[PDB]
């Protein structure tokens, strides 16, 4: 029912350099639909179910920042979730607050483009399945929560 995020992650990690190269050339999420290698990548992960397509398009798009741009790290046994996207972006020390500002205010499509730029720039360390859920919904609530996590992190750290 729910999309496997970790599977897709590892899949993207072990992808052949040519396919990765072919996917890395999209400049917009929907362009992934122009690319054979993409469908081959997401076929095992429920692409054929319309419910999961938009979601998958985002996931891959962000991953398409690089083969190891998004470093996944498991959460600690103690805490209930791992590192959030905002927090990681803030932790990188390379992302300026106004970037997030203009991100959460961006139109559809544009936001994902911007996000991917931020990911290449930061090479964040985060709980990937968490980010994946976030991308799965990606609405007002989530954008806001992103900026909040960023702000509070940058505040303490």
């Amino acid at each position: 029912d729910e999309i496997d995020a970790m599977a897709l992650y590892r899949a993207w990690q072990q992808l052949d350099n040519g396919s990765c190269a072919q996917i890395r050339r999209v400049s917009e999420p929907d362009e992934l639909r122009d690319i054979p290698a993409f469908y081959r990548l997401v076929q095992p992960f429920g692409w054929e179910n319309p419910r999961h397509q938009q979601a998958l398009l985002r996931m891959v798009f962000c991953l398409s920042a690089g083969k190891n741009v998004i470093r996944h790290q498991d959460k600690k046994s103690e805490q209930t979730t791992g590192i959030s996207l905002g927090r990681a972006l803030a932790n990188s020390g390379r992302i300026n607050e106004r970037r997030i500002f203009q991100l959460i205010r961006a139109d559809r499509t544009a936001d994902m483009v911007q996000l991917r730029r931020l990911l290449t720039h930061a090479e964040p360390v985060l709980d990937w399945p968490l980010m994946a859920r976030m991308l799965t919904w990606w609405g007002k609530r989530e954008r806001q929560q992103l900026l909040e996590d960023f702000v509070l992190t940058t505040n303490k750290n």
Binding site: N96, Q102, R105, D107, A110
Partner: protein, 357 residues
């Protein structure tokens, strides 16, 4: 005859930042559920007030301040040839409600508008009152008699005639209440705007800077809808009972300025000196804005300008028919019951002539 005159402007700006807030981000507003970029009414006002067109076709502008010491010295300087120093000081005191020492720091209650012409007139009055050893509250009593005689002076302070003034202290509280004759709206864009950001640096000529964090400046371009109306009667009253012709004159200057003046912010580094591409003037018994023409935000097709102009025109047709608005209207446009005007000057003339030339 119609009491109200409506001025609509569609003007398109190249990338720029014509107004910002406490975080130096472009001022915005939500309309139709989408973000428009906004140029506030006060900004437009001050733009027109301090313009050179104003200075050459309307006259002197009010002087807004709170520093009665500085104002003291200024007033002494430009009135010293007509009045005694303490006639001047006295007048200042009676109008401000604060004692005019030779102190170098004297604070009013708030930043208020000072028309110099007005103050000169009050200086004549206070001179009179000084000759007859008259008590202040009685001078007040006399002056409350004929307020029109004081408003006649706002012909050397038209900007207050247009935008009004509220009074809180001194005889102004009784004599100074002006209700503005011009209503003016915050400029908003006819389309959704996602603002761009400029990421700049400063190269230090004495050290090869390496890693650095770049400064940010929000900016955007956009097609703005400006709207203002003028209540002719109230202008006439605010000017001391001036003729309709003089009102219409001032109105015409407001049209010109609303069609040409652009706030000064960051213009030295973004240069958005664009004239308006559409100006329509419309005489009416009840003021009405055309803002709802762009409530459904304009989507671009070969730009935002033309689609905006057409949105405007269509809503104008629908409202004119719907609410039966037979009033003199004229439209000036750069693009190929409303009288079309080839040049801005023809429009201006049309307005001067009460809308039938």
């Amino acid at each position: 005859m119609s009491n109200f005159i409506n001025i609509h402007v569609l003007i398109s700006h190249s990338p720029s930042c014509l107004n910002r807030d406490d975080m130096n981000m472009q001022k915005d507003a939500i309309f139709g559920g989408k973000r428009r970029v906004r140029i506030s009414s006060q900004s437009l006002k001050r733009a027109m007030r301090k313009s050179g067109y104003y200075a050459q076709n309307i006259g002197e502008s009010s002087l807004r301040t709170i520093h009665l010491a500085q104002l003291r010295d200024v007033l002494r300087q430009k009135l010293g040839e007509r009045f005694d120093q303490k006639i001047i000081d006295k007048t200042l005191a009676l109008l401000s409600g604060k004692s005019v020492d030779e102190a170098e720091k004297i604070s009013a209650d708030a930043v208020t508008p000072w028309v110099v012409g007005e103050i000169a007139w009050f200086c004549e009055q206070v001179a009179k009152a000084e000759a007859d050893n008259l008590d202040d509250k009685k001078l007040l009593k006399v002056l409350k008699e004929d307020i029109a005689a004081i408003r006649v002076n706002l012909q050397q302070g038209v900007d207050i005639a247009l935008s009004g003034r509220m009074a809180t202290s001194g005889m102004m509280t009784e004599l100074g209440k002006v209700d503005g004759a011009m209503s003016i709206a915050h400029a908003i864009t006819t389309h959704q705007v996602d603002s761009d950001i400029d990421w700049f640096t400063a190269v230090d000529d004495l050290q090869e800077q390496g890693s650095a964090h770049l400064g940010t400046q929000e900016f955007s371009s956009g097609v703005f809808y400006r709207y203002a109306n003028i209540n002719l009667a109230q202008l006439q009253e605010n000017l001391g009972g001036a003729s309709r012709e003089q009102a219409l004159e001032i109105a015409t200057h407001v049209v010109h300025m609303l069609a040409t003046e652009v706030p000064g912010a960051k213009q030295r580094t973004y240069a958005a000196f664009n004239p308006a591409d559409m100006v329509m003037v419309n005489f009416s018994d009840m003021p009405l804005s055309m803002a709802n023409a762009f409530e459904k935000a304009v989507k671009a097709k070969d730009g935002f300008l033309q689609p905006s102009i057409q949105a405007f025109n269509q809503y104008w047709d629908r409202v004119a028919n719907g609410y039966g608005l037979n009033g003199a209207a004229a439209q000036f446009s750069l693009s190929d019951q409303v009288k079309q005007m080839p040049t801005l000057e023809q429009l201006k003339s049309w307005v001067r002539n009460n809308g039938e030339a």
